[PDB]
């Protein structure tokens, strides 16, 4: 017998592969597995782990988010890398001429980047031209901005959204939510 | 609690700034080994002085061998022991060749005749009596008679074999 200090036979709790059965994503994982192992560049290990993520773990990255990151000092000429979907954003009116490598582009995002003078490439093209991720800038979309995150941590005084179907008056704006009706939160 | 040895254990309190070089007390301890010897020394030093193993030290451990191991002596052992209902002092008189063998005999004797374990025995003193007729017990005085002789009737002979063909004798 052994006085076990930790739980035995514990899985790491991290994805070692994508749950997706997309054959082309498996080829991207196959390419970046080799790069993460045959290079010491930390960029390849980050990209390989990002290729495993689920859909909510890779939120879309706006072209406006891409353009704001290119306003950083000394970042005006870097290859923006988005392991996920790059969406369009009409609220911006000045996009720069830069190169974006992404897993997926929307039709509007591809049009806006190309029209500005830039170029849209895939992750395998990124690997050929930047094997160690030279002059790259990984961008991640907002993960806690999901609508399900609103209801996480519900409870008194927590200030979270209740899980509700119909909103308005007569739907949870009474006893428990105001001092004139019993108590508040 | 094996074949006993006698130990010359000297210990003292830890010296302080106010009173360095303490009085450096010594005891004679019967114990199976030095680990028990130090433990017994601290135990008896708890009965006498305001000290303990944490606030003191042992400066010397020395085995004491019999000066004349192969001459038969009469020993007077004072002992204080706890019975089931009280503490008693008694005096035993032992005839053997060493203090360790006499003390071993008394531990066997007190366990056999009084059910007093080594746990509840305090060896007050082991002192050889130099002269005959200063001995007080008849069970040892009877062996100090002139030209002592005695037989051993009914000799029991051990047989390696499980069967014997002779129906043997107990002559001696």
């Amino acid at each position: 017998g052994i006085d076990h200090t930790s739980k035995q036979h514990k899985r790491s709790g991290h994805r070692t592969a994508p749950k997706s059965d997309n054959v082309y994503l498996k080829l991207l994982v196959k390419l970046y597995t080799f790069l993460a192992r045959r290079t010491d560049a930390p960029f390849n290990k980050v990209v390989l782990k990002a290729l495993f993520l689920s859909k909510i773990n890779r939120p879309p990255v706006s072209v406006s988010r891409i353009a704001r990151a290119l306003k950083q000092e000394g970042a005006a000429n870097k290859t923006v890398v988005v392991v996920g979907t790059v969406t369009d954003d009409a609220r911006i009116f000045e996009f720069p001429k830069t190169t974006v490598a992404a897993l997926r582009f929307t039709a509007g995002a591809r049009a806006k980047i190309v029209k500005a003078g830039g170029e849209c490439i895939t992750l395998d093209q990124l690997a050929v031209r930047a094997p160690k991720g030279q002059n790259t800038l990984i961008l991640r979309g907002p993960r806690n901005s999901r609508e399900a995150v609103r209801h996480f941590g519900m409870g008194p005084h927590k200030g979270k959204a209740p899980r509700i179907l119909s909103t308005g008056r007569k739907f949870e704006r009474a006893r428990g939510r105001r001092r004139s009706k019993g108590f508040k939160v | 609690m094996a074949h006993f040895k006698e130990y010359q254990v000297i210990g003292r309190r830890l010296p302080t700034e106010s009173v360095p070089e303490p009085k450096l007390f010594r005891m004679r301890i019967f114990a199976s080994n030095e680990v028990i010897a130090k433990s017994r020394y601290w135990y008896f030093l708890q009965k006498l002085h305001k000290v303990k193993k944490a606030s003191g030290e042992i400066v010397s451990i020395n085995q004491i061998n019999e000066a004349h191991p192969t001459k038969v002596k009469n020993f007077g052992v004072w002992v204080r022991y706890d019975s089931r209902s009280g503490t008693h002092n008694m005096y035993k008189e032992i005839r053997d060749v060493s203090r360790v063998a006499a003390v071993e005999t008394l531990y066997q004797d007190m366990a056999a005749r009084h059910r007093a374990r080594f746990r509840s025995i305090h060896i007050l003193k082991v002192a050889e009596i130099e002269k005959t007729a200063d001995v007080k017990r008849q069970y040892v005085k009877q062996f100090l008679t002139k030209d002592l002789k005695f037989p051993l009737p009914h000799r029991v002979q051990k047989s390696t074999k499980t069967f014997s063909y002779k129906r043997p004798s107990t002559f001696y």
Partner: protein
């Protein structure tokens, strides 16, 4: 039935010390507290306002708020399987500086003094404290100290 009032089971906790009743001396009122100070909580039974609950008797916390005649203290309280941050408003009569912070604040001062002295020469001057070490070997003499001690004493009735 059962009674679980605010000051229940505090018959001896909130007693004053023997021959130490009466008015609180002025030292407690002249001590200056600041945010970040580490303070010990010990309620004064003579002062019934700003008085801590019986749980925080003997607890040590950090000052987060300084007020007119009171001090806000942060205490971590174990509820269930985790600790919870707690915030008390206590008058200065019920708190005092925990002296543990002052020796540590002198050790850091003495550490910097030793390091500054060691800067010019003599590196590795053992800034860290060490536990009590096993004693080194030494010689003990018997000049005036010849060992002499008796055996265990016999059992006397003493009554």
């Amino acid at each position: 039935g059962k009674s679980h009032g605010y000051r229940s089971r505090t018959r001896y906790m909130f007693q004053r010390d023997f021959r130490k009743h009466g008015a609180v001396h002025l030292s407690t009122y002249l001590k200056v507290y600041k945010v970040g100070d580490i303070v010990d909580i010990k309620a004064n039974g003579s002062i019934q306002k700003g008085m801590p609950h019986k749980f925080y008797q003997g607890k040590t916390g950090v000052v987060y708020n300084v007020t007119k005649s009171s001090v806000g203290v942060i205490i971590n309280k174990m509820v269930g399987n985790r600790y919870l941050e707690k915030r008390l408003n206590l008058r200065v009569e019920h708190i005092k500086h925990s002296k543990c912070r002052q020796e540590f604040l002198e050790r850091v001062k003495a550490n910097a003094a030793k390091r500054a002295e060691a800067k010019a020469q003599g590196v590795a001057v053992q800034l860290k404290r060490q536990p009590a070490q096993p004693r080194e070997s030494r010689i003990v003499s018997t000049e005036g100290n010849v060992p002499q001690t008796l055996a265990p004493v016999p059992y006397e009735t003493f009554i």
